[PDB]
Amino acid sequence: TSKKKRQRGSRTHGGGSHKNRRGAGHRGGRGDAGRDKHEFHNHEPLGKSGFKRPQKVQEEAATIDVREIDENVTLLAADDVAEFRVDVRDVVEEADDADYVKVLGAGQVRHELTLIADDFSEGAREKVEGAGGSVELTDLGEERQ
Amino acid sequence: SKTNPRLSSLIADLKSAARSSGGAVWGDVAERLEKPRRTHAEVNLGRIERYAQEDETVVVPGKVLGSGVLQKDVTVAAVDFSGTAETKIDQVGEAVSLEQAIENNPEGSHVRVIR
Amino acid sequence: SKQPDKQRKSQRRAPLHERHKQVRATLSADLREEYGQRNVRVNAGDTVEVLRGDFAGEEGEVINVDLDKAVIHVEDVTLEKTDGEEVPRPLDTSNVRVTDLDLEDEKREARLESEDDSA
Amino acid sequence: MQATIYDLDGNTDGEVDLPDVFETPVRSDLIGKAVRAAQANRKQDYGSDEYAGLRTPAESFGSGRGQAHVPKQDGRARRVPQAVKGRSAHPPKTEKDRSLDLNDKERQLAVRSALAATADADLVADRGHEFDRDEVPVVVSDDFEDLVKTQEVVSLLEALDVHADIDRADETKIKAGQGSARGRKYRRPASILFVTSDEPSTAARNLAGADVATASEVNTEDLAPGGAPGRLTVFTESALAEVAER
RNA sequence: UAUGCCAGCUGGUGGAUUGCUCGGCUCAGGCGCUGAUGAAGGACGUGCCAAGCUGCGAUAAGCUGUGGGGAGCCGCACGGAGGCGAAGAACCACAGAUUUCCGAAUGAGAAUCUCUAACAAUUGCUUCGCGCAAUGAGGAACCCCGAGAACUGAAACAUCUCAGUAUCGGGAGGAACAGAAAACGCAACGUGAUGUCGUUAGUAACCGCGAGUGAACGCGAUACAGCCCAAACCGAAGCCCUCACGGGCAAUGUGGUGUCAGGGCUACCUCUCAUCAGCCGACCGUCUUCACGAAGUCUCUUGGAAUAGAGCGUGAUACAGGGUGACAACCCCGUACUGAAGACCAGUACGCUGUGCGGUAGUGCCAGAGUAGCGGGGGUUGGAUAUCCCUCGCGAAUAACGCAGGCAUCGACUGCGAAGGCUAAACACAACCUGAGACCGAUAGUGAACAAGUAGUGUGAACGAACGCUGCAAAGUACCCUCAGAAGGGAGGCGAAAUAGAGCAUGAAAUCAGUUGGCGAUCGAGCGACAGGGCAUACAAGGUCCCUUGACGAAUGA
RNA sequence: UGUAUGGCAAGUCUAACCGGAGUAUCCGGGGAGGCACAGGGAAACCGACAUGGCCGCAGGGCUUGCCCGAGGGCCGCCGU
Ligand SMILES: [Cl-]
Ligand SMILES: [Cl-]
Ligand SMILES: [Cl-]
Ligand SMILES: [Mg+2]
Ligand SMILES: [Mg+2]
Ligand SMILES: [Mg+2]
Ligand SMILES: [Mg+2]
Ligand SMILES: [Mg+2]
Ligand SMILES: [Mg+2]
Ligand SMILES: [Mg+2]
Ligand SMILES: [Mg+2]
Ligand SMILES: [Mg+2]
Ligand SMILES: [Mg+2]
Ligand SMILES: [Mg+2]
Ligand SMILES: [Mg+2]
Ligand code: NA
Ligand code: NA
Ligand code: NA
Ligand code: NA
Ligand code: NA
Ligand code: NA
Ligand code: NA
Ligand code: NA
Ligand code: NA
Ligand code: NA
Ligand code: NA
Ligand code: NA
Ligand code: NA
Ligand code: NA
Ligand code: NA
Ligand code: NA
Ligand code: NA
Ligand code: NA
Ligand code: NA
Ligand SMILES: [Sr+2]
Ligand SMILES: [Sr+2]
Ligand SMILES: [Sr+2]
Ligand SMILES: [Sr+2]
Ligand SMILES: [Sr+2]
Ligand SMILES: [Sr+2]
Ligand SMILES: [Sr+2]
Ligand SMILES: [Sr+2]
Ligand SMILES: [Sr+2]
Ligand SMILES: [Sr+2]
Ligand SMILES: [Sr+2]
Ligand SMILES: [Sr+2]
Ligand SMILES: [Sr+2]
Ligand SMILES: [Sr+2]
Ligand SMILES: [Sr+2]
Ligand SMILES: [Sr+2]
Ligand SMILES: [Sr+2]
CB B73 within 8 A of CB B52: no
Contact D222, D213 (CB under 8 A): yes
**Protein CA at C50 to nucleotide C1' at E468, angstroms:** 35
The CA distance from B61 to B43, in Å, is 10
Distance CA C40, CA C118 (A): 8
Residue type, B103: E
Q: At D2, give phi and psi (nearest 5°).
A: -110, 140
**DSSP code of residue D239:** H
Which CATH number belongs to the domain containing residue C92 in this structure?
Answer: 2.30.30.30
Q: Among A50, A70, A89, where does a domain finish?
A: A50
Residues 54-113 of D with CB under 7 A from strand F: 103-109, 111
Which amino acid belongs to residue D205?
A: R
- CB < 7 A to strand F: residues 92-121, chain A: 94, 97, 102, 104-110, 121
CA atoms within 13 A on the CB side of C1: 6
Q: Using what technique was this structure determined? A: X-ray
Interface test with B, best of A71, A108, A109, A111 (most B CBs within 10 A): A71
Residues C48, C59 contacting (CB under 8 angstroms) = yes
The answer to whether the beta carbons of residues D169 and D209 sit under 8 Å apart is yes
Read out DSSP for B38-73? TSSEEE-HHHHHHH--TTSEEE-SEEE---S---S-
Q: Could you list the residue range(s) of the whole structural domain that residue A88 is in?
A: 51-144
What is residue D69's three-state secondary structure?
coil
Report the 10 Å Cβ neighbour count for C31. 20
Residues of D in contact with B4 (CB under 8 A): 27, 29
Touching A (3+ Cβ pairs <8 A), the chains are B
Q: Which residue type does D27 have?
A: R
Intra-chain end-to-end CA distance of chain C, in Å? 24
Q: Which nucleotide is nearest to A97 (CA to C1')?
A: E186
A51 Cα–ligand 24 center, Å? 77
Q: How far apart are CA B4 and CA B1, in angstroms?
A: 9
Separation CA A124–CA A115 (nearest Å): 10
**Burial zone of B32 (CB within 10 Å; 0-12 exposed, 13-18 middle, 19+ buried):** middle
Chain D partners of C8 at a C-beta cutoff of 8 Å? none
Hey, how many other C-beta atoms are within 10 angstroms of the C-beta on C102?
Answer: 16
In the structure, do chain A and chain C come into contact, i.e. share 3 or more CB pairs under 8 Å?
A: no
Number of residue pairs across C and D with CB atoms under 8 Å?
9
Residue D219 region by backbone torsions, left for phi larger than 0, else alpha for psi between -120 and 50, else beta: beta
User: Are D185 and C3 in contact (CB < 8 Å)?
Assistant: no
Please state, as a whole number, how many other Cβ atoms lie within 10 Å of the Cβ of residue A52.
6
On chain F, which bases lie within 7 A of the protein's CB atoms? Answer: 3-14, 20-22, 24-28, 30-31, 33, 37-38, 42-51, 58-62, 68-71, 79
Length of chain A: 145
Angle at D6 between CA D1 and CA D12, to 5 degrees: 85
Do you know the residue count of chain D?
246
Using the Cβ of C4 and the Cβ atoms of chain D, whether some distance falls under 8 Å is answered with yes
| CA D225 – CA D243 distance, rounded (Å) | 18
| Residue B6 to residue D28, Cβ atoms within 8 A | no
Resolution (A): 3.2
- DSSP type of residue A45: P
Whether C28 and C99 have beta carbons less than 8 Å apart is answered as: yes
Q: Which residues of A are less than 8 Å from B49 in CB distance?
A: none
Cβ-contact C69, C90 below 8 angstroms: yes
Are residue A125 and residue A58 in the same domain, yes or no?
A: yes
* Residue from A56, A133, A137, A58 nearest A103 by CA: A137
D115 touches strand F (CB under 7 A): no
Domain tally, chain A: 2
**Measured CA to C1', what is the nucleotide nearest B61?**
F70
Distance CA D99, CA D44 (A): 10
Tell me how far apart the terminal alpha carbons of chain D are, to the nearest angstrom: 18
Q: Which nucleotide is nearest to C85 (CA to C1')?
A: E478
- Tell me the C-alpha to C-alpha distance, in Å, between residue D88 and each of B70, B86, D49, D68, D178: 65, 58, 10, 20, 21
- Please provide the size of chain C in residues: 119
Q: Taking a C-beta distance cutoff of 8 angstroms, is the pair B61, B40 a contact?
A: yes
Is there a single domain that holds both residue A101 and residue A115? yes
Taking alpha carbons only, the member of B67, B33, B28 closest to residue B48 is B67
Q: Give which of B88, B104, B5 is closest to B43, Cα–Cα.
A: B88
- C76 conformational bin, left if phi > 0, alpha if psi -120 to 50, beta if neither: left
Give the count of beta carbons closer than 10 Å to the beta carbon of residue D7.
14
Of D180, D181, D183, the CB nearest to C2: D183
DSSP structural state of residue A70:
H
> What does the angle CA D63 – CA D66 – CA D69 come to, to the nearest 5 degrees?
50
C74-77 contacts: CB < 8 A, separation 24 or more?
A: C74/C48, C74/C50, C77/C50, C77/C53
At residue A86, φ and ψ (nearest 5 deg) are -135, 130
Rounded to an integer, what is the distance from CA A37 to the centroid of its chain? 35
Would you give the distance in Å from CA C53 to the centre of its chain?
Answer: 14
Record: contact D181-C4, CB cut-off 8 A: yes
Chains A and D touch (3+ CB pairs under 8 A): no
| Spatial distance between the Cα atoms of C25 and C96, rounded to a whole number of angstroms | 6
Q: Which domain holds residue C14?
A: 1-119
Q: Which residues of B33-44 are buried (b: 16+ CB within 10 A; e: fewer)?
A: beeeeeebbebb
Task: Pick out the nucleotide with least CA–C1' distance to B51.
Answer: F70
Structural domain of D205? 1-246
For residue B60, the distance in angstroms to the closest alpha carbon of chain D comes to 22
Q: Which of B59, B15, B62 is nearest to B38 (CA)?
A: B62
CA of D182 to C1' of E41 (A): 39
Q: Write down all domains in chain B, each with its CATH number in brackets.
A: 1-115 (3.100.10.10)
CA angle at residue D240 from D27 to D10, to 5 degrees? 115
Domain count, chain D: 1
Task: Please provide the DSSP assignment of D19-56 as one string.
Answer: -GGGGS---HHHHHHHHHHHHGGGPPP----TTTTT-S
How large is the angle between the packed helices D104-116 and D28-39, nearest 10 degrees? 120
Residue of C nearest to D180 (CA): C4
Residue B85 is inside which H or E element, if any? helix B85-89
Q: Count CB atoms within 10 A of the CB of residue D62.
A: 8
B89 touches strand F (CB under 7 A): no
D219 — contact with chain B (CB < 8 Å)? Answer: no
Environment class of residue B4 by beta-carbon count within 10 Å: exposed (0-12), middle (13-18) or buried (19+)? middle
In what helix (H) or strand (E) does residue A71 lie, and over which residues does it extend?
helix A66-71
Interface test with A, best of B69, B70, B71, B92 (most A CBs within 10 A): B69
Query: Do residues A9 and A63 share a domain?
Result: no
Count other Cβ atoms within 10 Å, centred on residue D117: 26
- The answer to whether the beta carbons of residues D212 and D31 sit under 8 Å apart is no
DSSP C89: P
Q: Which of D77, D70, D75, D79 is nearest to D52 (CA)?
A: D79
At C80, is the secondary structure helix, strand, or coil?
strand
Q: Using CA atoms, how far apart are residues A33 and C37, in angstroms rounded to an integer?
A: 83
Instruction: Tell which D residues from 20 to 49 touch B, by Cβ distance under 8 Å.
Output: 25, 27-29
Tell me the chain C residues in contact with residue D186 when contact means C-beta distances shorter than 8 Å.
none
* Distance to chain B for A71, nearest Cα, Å: 6
Instruction: Report d(CA D94, CA D108) in Å as an integer.
Output: 31
Residues D177 and D183: beta-carbon distance below 8 Å: no
| Pick from D170, D151, D159, D150: nearest CA to D212 | D150
Q: Is residue B93 within 8 Å of residue B30, measured between CB atoms?
A: no
Give the max Cα distance, chain C. Answer: 51
Q: Which CATH number is D59's domain given?
A: 3.40.1370.10
Quick one: which of C29, C39, C91, C35 has its CA closest to C62? Answer: C91
By the 8 A CB rule, do D21 and D109 touch? Answer: no
- Looking at the structure of chain C, the number of domains it has is 1
**SS3 label, residue D144:** helix
Q: Which residues contact C58 (CB under 8 A, 6 or more apart)?
A: C49, C50, C76, C77
Strands (E), chain C: 24-27, 39-41, 47-50, 59-66, 71-74, 78-80, 86-88, 96-100
Same domain, A3 and A61: no
Measured in angstroms, the CA of D183 and the nearest CA of chain C are apart by: 5
Phi, psi dihedral angles at B76 (to 5 degrees): -85, 145
Chain C residue numbers touching D183 (CB-CB < 8 A): 2-4
Same domain, A31 and A69: no
